[PDB]
Structures are given as C-alpha cells and as structure tokens.
Amino acid sequence: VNSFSGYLKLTDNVYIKNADIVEEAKKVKPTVVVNAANVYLKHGGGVAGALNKATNNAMQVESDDYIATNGPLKVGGSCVLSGHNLAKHCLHVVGPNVNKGEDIQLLKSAYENFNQHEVLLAPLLSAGIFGADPIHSLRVCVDTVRTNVYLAVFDKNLYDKLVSSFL
Ligand SMILES: Cn1cnc2c(N)nc(N)nc21
C-alpha cells in the first residue's frame, strides 16, 4: 500500500491523475518526483520551472553545482538530486525536445530511467513545451516502465483525452 490517492489505474503498474505536480508532491512527499529536465538543468518553465519555483530556487542552485562538476546530461539520460521540500529525491530526466529537433526514439531511453526506482511521481515525458504528442508519451511510458509510476496531468482537458483514448 502507498499514499497516492485518486488515481485511475491504467495497467498493472501505471496510474494517472489530473494533478499539478507541485501540489501532489507537497501532499505525498514521495520518495521520487521526476522532473522534465533539459541537459543543462536550466529549470525555466514547464514542470522544471514549477518544481524549481516551489523549492524557492534551491533546485536550480543544486543543479548549477551539478553541471559545473559533471557537465550536461545526455538527451534520454538522468541524474538523481535532492527532492528538497517536495520529495526525498528528484530524478531529473531529459526527454527529447521536439521544438529543438531531437529524435523522438530517445523517449523510450528517457523512460527507461524510471525502472531504477520502485515508485515514482512523474509527468509525461517530452509533452507540453517539449513538443511531443502526450498520447504517444503515455503509450511509451506504459510499454517501457515496469516500476510503479503515478502520472500527474495538469490540464483537465488533456487528462480526459489520455484516458478516453487509452488502449
Ligand atoms: C506539463 N506541466 C507543466 N506544468 C505542470 C505542472 N505544474 N504539473 C504537471 N503535472 N504537469 C505540468
């Protein structure tokens, strides 16, 4: 049993809800929250800006030190950093950004990072400002992630479309 509440069950391991990721993380304090990161860990908008704003910019300060030491992530890659006031850990995952011309086949590689964690709170990778089709992102998630993933969808309209169209 876990603390996650109000989710629709899509598969054995994937659950979905209409939820602002900041508010859900604040309520649950999950072991892992996933950030929709870029390779520079520049958390300017979307999930990254929302999460970082909720940490009072502590996520960005930590991220800048990580990049100064390690250099940029790979598209499809990840790193584990603090969850600050939101979670124990934040898994920063870089999905391909279609608005930068990145290979959508890298979305599967991005989701494979989730399999290193038994339970996660996450957004759909490469959707929204990253430019991918969220229906596609949900299909790759279900077909790639084997650990237990609780997906938060921000827009009530998109949530309803993802559920209605789910095979
Ligand atoms: C895609 N996107 C942008 N902002 C958010 C947010 N606050 N919450 C969730 N679940 N998704 C988001």
Side-chain angles (χ1 to χ4, degrees), residues 1-26 28-166:
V1 174
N2 66 51
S3 161
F4 287 105
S5 173
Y7 287 73
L8 171 67
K9 181 170 180 58
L10 292 176
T11 70
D12 181 60
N13 65 299
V14 177
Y15 293 81
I16 195 165
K17 184 184 178 177
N18 177 209
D20 156 20
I21 198 165
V22 171
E23 286 315 308
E24 189 75 2
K26 282 199 289 192
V28 176
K29 287 293 235 89
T31 306
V32 181
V33 64
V34 174
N35 181 32
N38 60 54
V39 294
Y40 305 110
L41 302 178
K42 287 172 56 94
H43 307 305
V47 164
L51 290 171
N52 174 59
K53 178 179 177 186
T55 76
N56 181 43
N57 209 53
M59 178 181 284
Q60 190 65 66
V61 169
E62 180 194 32
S63 293
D64 290 346
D65 169 83
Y66 173 89
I67 298 286
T69 299
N70 299 109
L73 300 176
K74 298 172 179 180
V75 179
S78 71
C79 69
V80 180
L81 291 173
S82 181
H84 299 279
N85 56 314
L86 303 179
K88 188 176 196 286
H89 305 286
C90 179
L91 181 70
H92 293 273
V93 180
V94 185
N97 188 328
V98 175
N99 306 316
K100 303 179 172 170
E102 298 168 351
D103 171 18
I104 195 58
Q105 298 305 136
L106 287 170
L107 186 54
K108 187 171 184 76
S109 301
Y111 273 116
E112 287 170 342
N113 297 287
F114 289 24
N115 290 320
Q116 300 295 317
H117 302 279
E118 288 191 349
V119 183
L120 315 86
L121 172 62
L124 285 168
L125 298 185
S126 295
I129 70 179
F130 286 63
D133 175 4
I135 297 174
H136 177 64
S137 182
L138 178 56
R139 183 30 65 188
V140 179
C141 181
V142 161
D143 292 344
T144 307
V145 180
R146 298 176 301 285
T147 57
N148 293 325
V149 57
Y150 288 87
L151 294 170
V153 186
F154 191 49
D155 179 64
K156 198 335 190 270
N157 183 294
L158 172 60
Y159 172 84
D160 287 348
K161 180 171 140 126
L162 285 167
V163 169
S164 288
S165 58
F166 184 69

